[PDB]
Design a protein that fits this description.
It is classed as transferase/dna. The chain is of the alpha+beta class. It is built from 22 helices and 17 strands. A six-stranded mixed beta sheet has the order 1-4-3-2-5-6. A four-stranded antiparallel beta sheet has the order 15-16-12-17. The longest helix is centred in the C-terminal third of the chain and has 37 residues. The chain starts with 5 loop residues before the first strand and ends in a 7-residue tail after the last strand. The relative contact order is 0.09. The structure holds a molecule of 2 linked components (GLC-FRU) (2 copies) and magnesium ion. The site of a molecule of 2 linked components (GLC-FRU) has 12 residues, from strand 9. It binds a DNA duplex through helix 10, helix 12, strand 10, helix 17 and helix 18.
DNA sequence: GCGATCAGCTT
DNA sequence: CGAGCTGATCGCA
């Protein structure tokens, strides 16, 4: 059973061949400034294991790592690249990434280790990472003989699996998606994460002190109105106070008790004064715990920066996710929460934050793919799409569109993009399922191309077994044939939504690639910091703002050519908050 | 400690 | 109605 390999004491020339499977192991989930516990190399000459303190101090090995002509095949090269960036070492020549390859082939597999990717091609001569390292409090790096064999086995699988993975990607017309989009993007994300975002901790600490004062006042007011002290953050104890002691109506229930959601509490406000205070307490408590305290926990004390990790291989649509901290959900909607963004500042003196976002990219992608004449014309005239939808579905002129009509047409537009269902829209607009169905019916009469696409896409998902995006990303939908109404409906909604949300993901990913290429051609010091689904956040010297005002929107607008134009809005300021 | 449940923040 | 991550509580060991 055991796999042969050389547990080397020093680096030799045969370990530096021009094609190899490479493993640079970082066990810690958060790889920023984290240890590299071991190194494995597999090539035409054999299998090798190197101790990191030895290999990373060897000039010939470091040079090999940074030589772009020396091709490497890896799994999660971004993790390795960043851990190496923290050590001052540049990783180049990664021509194949098994994690990204597995992800494009089928994102539903949830491949998060070499073993899971390998199982897709009936290769099982490698253990899962969790089996070797354990989990949670028991998580630990094993002794050298166990560690070394695991790393060599991982590199061996990568070496073996490259050909079959590339062959299937080619068959799926996804070879260019891997090589020209996801892999170059991986390198860009690595730079962004390493750069980090500077945080004004003193601003945060002062906001935290003001919130603590306001929480105390509201908290005591809640105990006064209830005539009793209890744990407000406990939906169980709160439910007793509201629905039993104060006798408030039960409009909705959960699986384990009474519902205390914001929308539920919103309806209970007129009955008792305690309701508005609990809502206010929930608002302040969310900012304090998640955005003040939670953010302060992950700020590096030396540099005052946050280094998020973008998961490029998780979502089923092709979007990225962000963790430790999640910087894709910083408050913006309410002013009190929006002020959290004042804490995100440029990393250098006399630099500014520049933010640029696509305007209605999802609805524009839908106009393109459905080839709906009305929707295409709307965007060609650059109309306010929600006002336009209201005019159409409610049969009125522009002057006759009221604020409530626009708000409801806006909801119909979101529903259409998310995969339309009468029950979901109804819940969202607080109306009946029958009334919501009336809006949908009206929409499809005004936008017959969109109705045709929605019908056709569901049919295609059933015929092929999957749906695809503009740049050939795919999502398998086996539940599209289920005889369970709920399970089948969800797959139908995903069939409708994925090519829209997914193609928008394709476009911004390409824009980021195109942008970095332009920033480098123009020798600008400007660099990407964050991506929030339809927007790009950068920082640059103040002297570069005027060039960016022209460069950034143009690159983002020209990323792809659709049947309708792409439109990008932009702003800049002293903090992320001011870039509005 | 572990994770199920509920709640809330974003696009 | 689509796609995510994280904090507090509570029942569990
Ligand atoms: O390095 C990110 C990359 O690693 C995976 C596992 O293959 O996720 C790991 O890292 C994440 C960020 O630290 C953690 O949230 C997660 O718990 C951990 O398994 C991939 O999913 C991801 O692409
Ligand atoms: O001060 C701690 C003590 O207060 C209680 C209620 O008297 O809970 C309150 O304080 C907690 C921590 O700040 C909050 O999570 C909670 O929402 C609030 O009601 C007790 O539960 C706690 O022992
Ligand atoms: Mg936008």
């Amino acid at each position: 059973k055991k796999m042969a390999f050389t547990l080397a004491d020093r680096v030799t020339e045969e370990m530096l061949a021009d094609k190899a499977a490479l493993v640079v192991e970082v066990v810690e989930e958060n790889y920023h400034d984290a240890p590299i516990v071991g190194i494995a190399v597999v090539n035409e000459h054999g299998r090798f294991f190197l101790r990191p303190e030895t290999a990373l101090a060897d000039p010939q090995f470091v040079a090999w790592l940074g030589d772009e002509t020396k091709k490497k095949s890896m799994f999660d090269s971004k993790r390795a690249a960043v851990a190496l960036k923290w050590k001052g070492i540049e990783l180049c020549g990664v021509s194949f990434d098994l994690l990204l390859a597995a992800y494009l082939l089928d994102p539903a597999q949830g491949v998060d280790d070499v073993a899971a990717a390998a199982k897709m091609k009936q290769y099982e001569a490698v253990r899962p990472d969790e089996a070797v390292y354990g989990k949670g409090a028991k998580r630990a790096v094993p002794d050298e003989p166990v560690l070394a064999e695991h790393l060599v086995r991982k590199a061996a699988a990568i070496w073996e699996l490259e050909r079959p993975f590339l062959d299937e990607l080619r068959r799926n017309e996804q070879d260019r998606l891997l090589v020209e989009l996801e892999q170059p993007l991986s390198s860009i994300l690595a730079e962004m994460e390493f750069a980090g975002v500077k945080v004004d901790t003193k601003r945060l600490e002062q906001m935290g002190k003001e919130l603590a004062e306001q929480l105390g006042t509201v908290e005591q007011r809640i105990y006064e109105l209830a005539g009793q002290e209890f744990n407000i953050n406990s939906p169980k104890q709160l439910g007793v106070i509201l629905f039993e002691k104060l006798q408030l109506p039960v409009l909705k229930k959960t699986k384990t008790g009474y519902s205390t959601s914001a929308d539920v509490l919103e309806k209970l406000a007129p009955y008792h004064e305690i309701v508005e205070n609990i809502l206010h307490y929930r608002q302040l408590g969310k900012l304090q715990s998640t955005y003040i305290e939670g953010l302060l926990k992950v700020v590096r004390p030396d540099t005052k920066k946050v280094h998020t990790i973008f998961n490029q291989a998780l979502t089923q649509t092709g979007r990225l996710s962000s963790t430790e901290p999640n910087l894709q959900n910083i408050p913006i909607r309410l002013e009190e929460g929006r002020k959290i963004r004042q804490a995100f500042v440029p990393s250098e003196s006399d630099w500014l934050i520049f933010a640029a976002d696509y305007s209605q990219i999802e609805l524009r992608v839908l106009a393109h793919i459905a080839e709906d004449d009305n929707l295409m014309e709307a965007f060609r005239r650059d109309l306010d799409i929600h006002t336009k939808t209201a005019m159409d579905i409610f049969q009125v002129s522009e002057d006759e569109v009221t604020p409530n009509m626009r708000r409801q047409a806006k909801a119909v537009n979101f529903g259409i993009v998310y995969g339309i269902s009468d029950y979901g829209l109804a819940q969202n607009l607080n109306i009946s399922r029958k009334e919501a169905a009336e809006f949908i019916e009206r929409y499809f009469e005004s936008f017959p191309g969109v109705k045709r696409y929605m019908e056709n896409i569901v049919q295609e998902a059933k015929q092929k077994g999957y749906v695809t995006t503009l740049l050939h990303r795919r999502r398998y939908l086996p539940d599209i044939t289920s005889r369970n109404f709920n399970v089948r409906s969800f797959a139908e909604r995903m069939a409708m939504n994925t090519p829209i949300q997914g193609s928008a993901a394709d476009i911004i990913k390409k824009a980021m690639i195109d942008l970095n290429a332009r920033l480098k051609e123009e020798r600008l010091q400007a660099h990407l910091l964050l991506q929030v689904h339809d927007e790009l956040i950068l920082e640059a010297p103040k002297e570069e703002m005027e060039r960016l005002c022209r460069l950034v929107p143009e690159v983002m607008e020209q990323a792809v050519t659709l049947r309708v134009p792409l439109k990008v809005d932009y702003h800049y300021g002293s903090t992320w908050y001011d870039a509005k």
